[PDB]
Coordinates of C-alpha atoms in Angstrom, one line a residue:
Chain A
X1 CA -20.6 38.9 -1.8
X2 CA -21.4 42.3 -2.7
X3 CA -19.1 45.5 -4.2
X4 CA -18.6 45.0 -7.9
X5 CA -16.2 47.7 -7.7
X6 CA -13.3 47.0 -10.1
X7 CA -10.2 45.5 -8.3
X8 CA -6.4 46.5 -8.7
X9 CA -3.3 44.2 -7.0
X10 CA 0.0 44.2 -6.7
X11 CA 2.1 41.6 -5.8
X12 CA 5.8 41.6 -4.7
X13 CA 7.8 38.0 -4.5
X14 CA 11.3 37.8 -3.5
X15 CA 12.2 34.0 -4.3
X16 CA 15.5 32.5 -2.8
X17 CA 16.1 29.5 -4.7
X18 CA 18.5 26.9 -3.1
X19 CA 20.6 24.0 -4.8
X20 CA 22.4 21.4 -2.6
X21 CA 21.9 23.7 0.2
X22 CA 24.2 27.0 -0.2
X23 CA 26.0 25.4 -3.3
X24 CA 24.0 27.3 -5.9
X25 CA 21.7 30.1 -5.4
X26 CA 19.4 32.4 -7.5
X27 CA 17.2 35.5 -6.5
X28 CA 14.3 36.2 -8.3
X29 CA 12.3 39.4 -7.6
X30 CA 9.1 39.4 -9.3
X31 CA 6.4 42.4 -9.7
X32 CA 3.2 41.3 -10.8
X33 CA 0.3 43.5 -11.6
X34 CA -3.5 42.0 -11.7
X35 CA -1.7 38.7 -11.6
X36 CA 0.8 39.3 -14.5
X37 CA 4.3 39.3 -13.9
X38 CA 5.6 42.7 -15.5
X39 CA 9.0 42.9 -14.4
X40 CA 11.5 41.2 -12.5
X41 CA 15.3 41.0 -11.3
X42 CA 17.2 37.9 -12.2
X43 CA 20.4 36.9 -10.4
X44 CA 21.4 34.9 -13.2
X45 CA 20.6 37.9 -15.2
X46 CA 21.8 40.8 -13.1
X47 CA 20.0 43.2 -13.5
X48 CA 16.0 44.5 -14.3
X49 CA 14.2 43.0 -17.3
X50 CA 10.8 43.9 -18.5
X51 CA 8.1 40.8 -19.0
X52 CA 5.2 42.9 -20.3
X53 CA 5.0 46.3 -22.0
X54 CA 3.9 47.6 -18.7
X55 CA 7.4 46.8 -17.2
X56 CA 9.6 48.5 -19.2
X57 CA 9.7 51.8 -17.7
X58 CA 10.7 50.3 -14.7
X59 CA 13.5 48.3 -15.8
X60 CA 15.1 51.2 -17.4
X61 CA 14.1 53.5 -14.1
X62 CA 15.6 50.8 -12.2
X63 CA 18.6 49.8 -13.8
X64 CA 20.1 53.1 -14.2
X65 CA 20.5 53.4 -10.7
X66 CA 23.3 51.4 -10.4
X67 CA 23.9 51.3 -6.6
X68 CA 20.9 49.6 -6.2
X69 CA 22.1 47.1 -8.9
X70 CA 24.6 46.0 -6.6
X71 CA 22.8 45.7 -3.6
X72 CA 20.4 43.7 -5.7
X73 CA 23.3 41.3 -7.0
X74 CA 24.7 40.9 -3.6
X75 CA 21.5 39.6 -1.7
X76 CA 22.0 36.0 -3.0
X77 CA 24.4 36.5 -0.2
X78 CA 23.1 39.1 2.4
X79 CA 19.5 38.1 1.6
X80 CA 19.0 34.6 0.2
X81 CA 22.0 32.6 1.9
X82 CA 21.8 34.9 5.2
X83 CA 18.3 33.7 5.4
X84 CA 18.9 30.1 4.5
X85 CA 21.2 29.9 7.6
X86 CA 19.0 31.5 10.1
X87 CA 15.7 29.1 9.3
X88 CA 17.6 25.5 8.5
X89 CA 17.4 24.4 12.0
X90 CA 13.7 24.4 12.0
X91 CA 12.6 24.2 8.5
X92 CA 15.3 22.3 6.0
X93 CA 15.6 19.8 8.9
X94 CA 12.1 19.5 10.3
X95 CA 11.4 15.9 10.8
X96 CA 7.9 14.7 11.7
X97 CA 7.2 10.7 11.8
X98 CA 4.2 9.8 9.8
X99 CA 1.4 8.0 11.5
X100 CA 0.4 5.0 9.1
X101 CA -3.2 3.4 9.1
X102 CA -5.0 0.9 7.5
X103 CA -8.8 0.1 6.8
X104 CA -11.2 -1.1 3.6
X105 CA -13.4 0.7 1.7
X106 CA -15.8 -0.3 -1.7
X107 CA -16.3 1.0 -4.6
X108 CA -13.1 -4.5 -2.6
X109 CA -10.5 -1.3 -1.7
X110 CA -7.6 -1.2 0.8
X111 CA -6.5 2.2 2.1
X112 CA -3.0 3.1 3.5
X113 CA -3.5 6.3 5.1
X114 CA -0.3 8.4 6.1
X115 CA -0.6 11.7 7.6
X116 CA 1.1 13.9 9.8
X117 CA 4.4 14.2 8.3
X118 CA 7.2 16.4 7.1
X119 CA 9.1 16.8 5.0
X120 CA 6.8 15.5 1.8
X121 CA 9.3 13.1 0.4
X122 CA 8.1 9.7 0.9
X123 CA 7.6 6.5 -0.1
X124 CA 4.6 4.0 0.1
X125 CA 4.4 0.3 -1.1
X126 CA 1.8 -2.1 -0.7
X127 CA 2.6 -5.7 0.1
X128 CA 0.4 -9.0 -0.6
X129 CA 2.1 -11.5 1.4
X130 CA 5.6 -9.8 1.2
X131 CA 5.2 -10.0 -2.5
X132 CA 5.1 -5.9 -3.3
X133 CA 2.0 -4.9 -5.6
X134 CA 3.2 -2.6 -8.3
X135 CA -0.1 -2.7 -10.0
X136 CA -3.5 -1.8 -9.0
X137 CA -2.4 1.0 -6.9
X138 CA -4.2 4.1 -6.9
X139 CA -2.5 7.4 -5.0
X140 CA -4.2 10.7 -4.0
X141 CA -0.5 12.5 -4.2
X142 CA 0.8 14.8 -1.8
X143 CA -1.6 16.7 0.1
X144 CA -0.2 19.8 2.3
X145 CA -1.8 20.4 5.1
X146 CA -0.9 24.3 5.6
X147 CA 0.4 23.8 9.3
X148 CA 3.9 21.8 7.8
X149 CA 2.6 18.5 7.8
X150 CA 1.7 16.7 4.9
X151 CA -0.9 13.3 4.2
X152 CA -1.6 11.2 1.6
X153 CA -4.0 8.0 0.8
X154 CA -2.9 4.8 -1.5
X155 CA -5.5 2.8 -2.3
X156 CA -4.7 -1.2 -3.1
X157 CA -7.8 -2.3 -5.3
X158 CA -7.9 -6.1 -4.6
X159 CA -10.4 -9.2 -3.8
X160 CA -9.0 -10.7 -0.2
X161 CA -9.0 -13.8 1.0
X162 CA -8.5 -15.1 4.4
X163 CA -4.8 -16.4 4.3
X164 CA -3.8 -13.1 3.0
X165 CA -1.9 -10.6 4.9
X166 CA -1.9 -7.4 3.1
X167 CA 1.1 -4.7 4.5
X168 CA 1.4 -1.0 4.0
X169 CA 5.0 0.0 4.3
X170 CA 6.2 3.4 4.5
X171 CA 9.8 5.0 4.2
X172 CA 10.7 8.8 5.0
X173 CA 13.3 10.4 6.4
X174 CA 12.1 11.0 10.0
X175 CA 12.5 6.9 10.6
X176 CA 15.3 4.9 10.1
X177 CA 13.5 1.6 9.3
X178 CA 10.4 1.4 7.2
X179 CA 6.8 1.5 9.2
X180 CA 4.7 -1.0 7.9
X181 CA 0.8 -1.8 9.0
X182 CA -0.5 -5.0 8.4
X183 CA -4.2 -5.8 7.3
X184 CA -6.2 -9.3 7.6
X185 CA -9.1 -10.3 5.6
Chain B
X1 CA 16.3 21.7 -3.3
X2 CA 14.2 24.5 -1.7
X3 CA 12.6 27.6 -2.0
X4 CA 12.0 30.7 -0.1
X5 CA 9.8 33.1 -0.9
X6 CA 8.6 36.9 0.9
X7 CA 5.3 37.5 -0.8
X8 CA 3.4 40.8 -0.2
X9 CA 0.7 42.7 -1.8
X10 CA -1.6 45.5 -1.7
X11 CA -4.8 45.9 -2.9
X12 CA -7.1 48.4 -4.1
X13 CA -9.6 49.9 -3.3
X14 CA -10.1 47.5 -0.1
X15 CA -6.7 48.4 1.5
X16 CA -5.8 45.2 2.4
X17 CA -2.3 43.9 2.4
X18 CA 0.2 41.1 3.8
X19 CA 3.8 40.1 4.3
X20 CA 4.9 36.6 4.7
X21 CA 7.8 34.4 4.2
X22 CA 7.0 31.2 2.5
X23 CA 9.5 27.9 2.8
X24 CA 8.5 25.1 0.2
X25 CA 4.5 25.9 0.2
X26 CA 4.7 26.7 4.0
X27 CA 4.3 30.1 6.1
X28 CA 7.2 30.4 8.2
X29 CA 5.1 33.8 9.2
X30 CA 3.7 36.6 8.1
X31 CA 3.7 40.2 9.9
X32 CA 0.2 41.4 12.0
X33 CA 0.2 44.9 10.2
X34 CA -1.7 46.7 13.0
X35 CA 0.0 45.5 16.1
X36 CA 3.0 45.8 14.1
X37 CA 4.2 42.0 15.2
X38 CA 5.9 38.9 13.8
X39 CA 3.4 36.1 13.9
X40 CA 5.5 32.8 13.6
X41 CA 3.4 30.3 12.0
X42 CA 4.4 27.6 14.9
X43 CA 5.1 28.9 18.2
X44 CA 8.6 27.3 18.1
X45 CA 9.9 28.8 15.4
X46 CA 9.5 32.1 17.4
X47 CA 12.5 30.8 19.6
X48 CA 15.1 30.4 16.8
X49 CA 14.7 33.3 15.0
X50 CA 13.3 36.6 14.9
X51 CA 12.3 39.2 12.5
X52 CA 11.9 43.3 12.4
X53 CA 8.1 43.7 11.8
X54 CA 8.4 47.3 11.4
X55 CA 10.2 46.7 8.2
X56 CA 7.3 44.9 6.5
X57 CA 5.4 48.2 7.1
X58 CA 7.8 50.3 5.2
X59 CA 7.5 47.5 2.2
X60 CA 3.6 47.6 2.0
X61 CA 4.0 51.3 2.1
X62 CA 6.0 51.2 -1.4
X63 CA 3.8 48.5 -2.6
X64 CA 0.9 50.6 -2.2
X65 CA 2.8 53.7 -3.9
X66 CA 3.4 51.3 -6.4
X67 CA 0.1 49.9 -7.1
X68 CA -1.4 53.4 -7.2
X69 CA 1.3 54.2 -10.4
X70 CA 0.6 50.7 -12.1
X71 CA -3.2 51.3 -11.6
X72 CA -3.1 54.5 -13.6
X73 CA -0.4 53.5 -16.0
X74 CA -2.6 50.3 -17.0
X75 CA -5.1 53.1 -17.5
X76 CA -7.1 51.4 -14.8
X77 CA -7.3 48.0 -16.3
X78 CA -9.0 45.8 -13.3
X79 CA -7.7 42.5 -12.3
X80 CA -9.9 39.4 -13.9
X81 CA -11.7 37.4 -10.7
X82 CA -10.5 33.5 -10.5
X83 CA -13.0 31.8 -8.7
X84 CA -11.4 29.1 -6.2
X85 CA -11.7 25.4 -5.7
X86 CA -12.6 24.6 -2.5
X87 CA -11.6 21.2 -0.5
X88 CA -12.6 19.6 2.6
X89 CA -10.6 17.2 4.2
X90 CA -9.6 15.9 7.8
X91 CA -6.3 15.9 9.8
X92 CA -6.4 12.4 10.0
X93 CA -8.6 9.7 9.6
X94 CA -11.6 9.9 11.6
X95 CA -12.9 7.5 14.5
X96 CA -15.8 8.9 16.4
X97 CA -15.1 10.7 20.1
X98 CA -11.6 11.0 18.8
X99 CA -10.8 14.6 18.2
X100 CA -9.7 15.6 14.6
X101 CA -9.6 18.8 12.5
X102 CA -11.6 19.8 9.6
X103 CA -9.8 21.5 6.9
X104 CA -11.1 23.8 4.4
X105 CA -8.5 24.6 1.5
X106 CA -9.5 27.0 -0.8
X107 CA -7.4 27.4 -3.6
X108 CA -6.3 28.9 -7.2
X109 CA -8.0 32.1 -6.6
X110 CA -7.5 35.9 -7.2
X111 CA -8.1 38.5 -5.6
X112 CA -7.2 37.9 -2.2
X113 CA -10.4 38.7 -0.4
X114 CA -12.8 35.6 0.8
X115 CA -15.6 34.4 3.3
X116 CA -15.5 31.6 4.6
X117 CA -17.9 30.2 7.2
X118 CA -18.4 26.8 8.9
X119 CA -21.7 25.5 9.0
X120 CA -22.3 22.6 11.8
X121 CA -25.9 21.3 10.6
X122 CA -26.7 24.5 8.9
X123 CA -25.4 26.9 11.7
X124 CA -22.4 28.7 12.2
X125 CA -19.4 27.7 14.3
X126 CA -16.5 30.0 15.2
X127 CA -15.3 28.0 18.4
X128 CA -11.9 27.1 18.0
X129 CA -11.6 27.9 14.5
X130 CA -8.5 29.2 13.0
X131 CA -7.0 30.2 9.5
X132 CA -3.9 31.4 7.3
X133 CA -3.0 34.5 5.7
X134 CA -3.0 34.1 1.6
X135 CA 0.0 31.8 0.8
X136 CA 1.2 32.6 -2.2
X137 CA 1.1 30.1 -5.8
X138 CA 3.4 29.7 -9.1
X139 CA 0.9 31.1 -11.4
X140 CA 0.3 34.3 -8.7
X141 CA -3.0 33.0 -7.3
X142 CA -3.6 32.0 -3.8
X143 CA -4.1 29.6 -1.3
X144 CA -5.8 29.7 2.0
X145 CA -6.5 27.3 5.2
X146 CA -9.1 27.5 7.5
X147 CA -9.5 24.8 10.3
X148 CA -12.7 23.8 12.6
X149 CA -11.5 21.2 15.5
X150 CA -14.2 18.9 16.1
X151 CA -15.6 15.9 17.6
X152 CA -16.4 13.2 14.8
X153 CA -20.3 12.5 16.0
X154 CA -22.5 10.5 13.7
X155 CA -25.7 12.7 14.0
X156 CA -23.4 15.8 13.0
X157 CA -23.1 16.9 9.3
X158 CA -20.5 19.7 8.1
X159 CA -20.1 22.5 5.5
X160 CA -17.8 25.1 4.5
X161 CA -19.1 28.2 2.9
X162 CA -16.9 30.3 0.7
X163 CA -17.8 33.2 -1.2
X164 CA -15.7 35.2 -3.6
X165 CA -16.5 37.9 -6.9
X166 CA -15.7 34.5 -8.9
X167 CA -18.4 33.0 -8.0
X168 CA -22.4 33.3 -8.8
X169 CA -23.3 31.8 -5.2
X170 CA -21.7 30.6 -2.3
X171 CA -19.9 27.6 -2.6
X172 CA -21.1 24.9 0.0
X173 CA -18.6 22.0 0.5
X174 CA -19.9 19.2 2.5
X175 CA -18.2 16.3 4.7
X176 CA -19.9 13.9 7.1
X177 CA -18.9 10.8 8.6
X178 CA -19.7 8.2 6.0
Chain C
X1 CA 17.9 37.9 12.8
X2 CA 15.6 37.2 9.2
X3 CA 16.4 39.4 7.0
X4 CA 14.0 41.6 4.9
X5 CA 14.5 42.4 0.9
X6 CA 13.2 46.2 -0.1
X7 CA 10.9 46.8 -3.2
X8 CA 12.3 49.9 -5.4
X9 CA 10.1 52.8 -5.8
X10 CA 8.5 53.5 -9.4
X11 CA 9.5 56.7 -11.2
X12 CA 6.5 59.1 -10.1
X13 CA 6.9 61.8 -12.0
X14 CA 6.4 59.5 -15.3
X15 CA 7.5 60.5 -18.6

């Protein structure tokens, strides 16, 4: 890794934020130089605002072009909502079923692995003999694979004993009844 | 609740830039600037929508022109390098002779230039590998994913080699079947 | 068709 020549970076983000689907929409145009946001257009505000000194000129210059400000204010409909509609089918309503597996580790530890699922809202529970274990449970938290699936690991610290049935239970919008995987001493 | 983000950048003096849509942290697509074609993150996205690729190039031209202005306006203040955190992990839990995928997840860095090499037993591997573009983060740093499909063997050992201006030396991230 | 939003140009002859 050579070439210490100084770098200069410009980033544009148009963030459409949705609440209860189309019900409430907010549009955020952020302009960022060298990782610092310098000026933005917040649909809640309705005009450009400077975030740092560096952004002041653009705010004024763009604000003074009133035909553009209107284009922008409409964008929550012409862009944000329009786009929401086009993508919903394969994004908002994407459902992939988790795959669940159990296996022991040492540190004894039990490991529940839930992989390959979408969306990321999920509930994973441990059961000892059908008594939910709410303590001694340590989770890896959501992990985004980058391929539109998630994975996570939930660990139960426990000293097993034959005659004990451990269950990992998973709830997720992709399935109707919880998935369960059982592991025995 | 959800968020869609059209994210684009121009970088100087490298003269690199990208255009992409992000849904809740996932790439919907980006535009291949050279081929001027829309590249859907998952093939099946491409049958339920389309996008005017040329538009991206126009946007990138505006981005570049504005960069050039900001560069001078800042009086040539350069970006500060932020080295990434790197993490290797598998698509699913590993069972020998069951095909899996190794994931190199490069995160929390800027500017968006990295070098990533897959190292099997210390040797470079390129067979079947793939990667993502630079994905956006709220603090304006970047994410990037590299992928290496593989057969889990007990003799085989793996490394993800990552270089970036914010690092004093390549960052190696190890993974073996244990 | 998915819609693109277009960034504004900055003032080229600055004050």
